[PDB]
Amino acid sequence: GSHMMATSDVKPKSISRAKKWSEEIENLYRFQQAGYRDEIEYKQVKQVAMVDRWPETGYVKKLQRRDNTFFYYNKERECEDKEVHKVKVYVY
């Protein structure tokens, strides 16, 4: 009978396109690049709860990609309007 639906993990409802630059987008870009849809997917991979972030803005300091490689991110805003359009947004 296969397996019931997960209660600890929620799959994305749909995918939209970011309009402007916001912690929601910039973050999604970093995570999406790593191969994750959202922090939720990331946490499951490393089975954690807290993500390394800077107090200045609260951006992700580093994120491991799907290739098992650590990628350093620039807290000093890295996403530009050009990325907003190219960057997609996942909705649950």
Question: Which technique was used to obtain these atomic coordinates?
Answer: NMR
Helix (H, G, I), strand (E, B) or coil at 6: coil
Distances (CA, A) of 34 to 7, 44, 71: 24, 13, 8
Alpha carbon distance 56, 12 (integer Å) = 29
Domain that holds residue 86: 1-92
Alpha carbon distance 23, 36 (integer Å) = 16
List CB contacts of 65: < 8 A, sequence separation 6 or more. 33, 34, 35, 71
Beta strand residue intervals within 14-61, DSSP E: 14-17
